[PDB]
Amino acid sequence: GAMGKVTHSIHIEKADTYGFSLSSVEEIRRLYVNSVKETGLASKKGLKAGDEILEINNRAADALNSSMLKDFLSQPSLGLLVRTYPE
């Protein structure tokens, strides 16, 4: 594989969790997947650790508050667009 950008559109639905952790970072704020629970709902959808979250529920990552972010991760349904790297 090479250096072209590949992105992956994911929809997850559910007491239950989605089963991934996500780090908020700056350097340029960014949202990265740290880990994905083996056998969890995000894993069956092909979410991978190190994916970068670009959009959540049709909103750009940059434009997301800790507040929209808390609210989005708590809802029963979750739409993500992620950048995914070759393996």
Binding site: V25, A42, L78
Partner: peptide
Amino acid sequence: TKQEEFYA
């Protein structure tokens, strides 16, 4: 610099 970690 890590600001927050969410366990979703």
